[PDB]
Amino acid sequence: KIFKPEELRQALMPTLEALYRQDPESLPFRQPVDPQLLGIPDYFDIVKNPMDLSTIKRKLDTGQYQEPWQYVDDVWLMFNNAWLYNRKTSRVYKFCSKLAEVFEQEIDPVMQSLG
Numbered sequence: 001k002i003f004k005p006e007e008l009r010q011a012l013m014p015t016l017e018a019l020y021r022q023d024p025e026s027l028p029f030r031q032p033v034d035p036q037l038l039g040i041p042d043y044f045d046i047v048k049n050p051m052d053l054s055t056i057k058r059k060l061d062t063g064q065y066q067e068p069w070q071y072v073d074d075v076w077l078m079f080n081n082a083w084l085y086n087r088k089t090s091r092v093y094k095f096c097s098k099l100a101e102v103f104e105q106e107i108d109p110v111m112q113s114l115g
């Protein structure tokens, strides 16, 4: 099966918007990690490939996903980085877990519709 970029954008954008609309839980994830500004300069000793909502938005808007699972992989990358770098007791970790629950509710029916 072939997916045109505008079909992916149409189908997937509501699931990305649902993540943005979690307030305050999306706030750690709305911008690319800047380790010096955030006071976490060792970040890229732990995480290699950063991901955030603004980068996913741009990739969706510019046709950078061939297949819907490439979009899922980037959201999962964003979550994995946060669950790796931050302690289980931390705000960022807990906010990530909230977003992950919302993401399932959004993406699971879409992925099944898209086949």
Ligand SMILES: C[C@@H]1CC(=O)Nc2cc3cc(c2N1)/C=C/CCCN1CCCc2ccc(cc21)OCCNC3=O
Pocket (backbone or CB within 6 Å): 027, 028, 029, 033, 038, 039, 040, 081, 082, 085, 086, 092
């Ligand atoms: C996903 C990304 C990277 C990560 O995996 N862990 C984080 C750690 C800190 C901060 C963030 C993280 N998210 C991003 C946070 C939200 C920014 C909210 N704002 C709003 C403006 C004022 C302010 C001041 C200090 C601050 C956050 C802060 O936090 C200092 C130490 N930062 C983290 O510990």
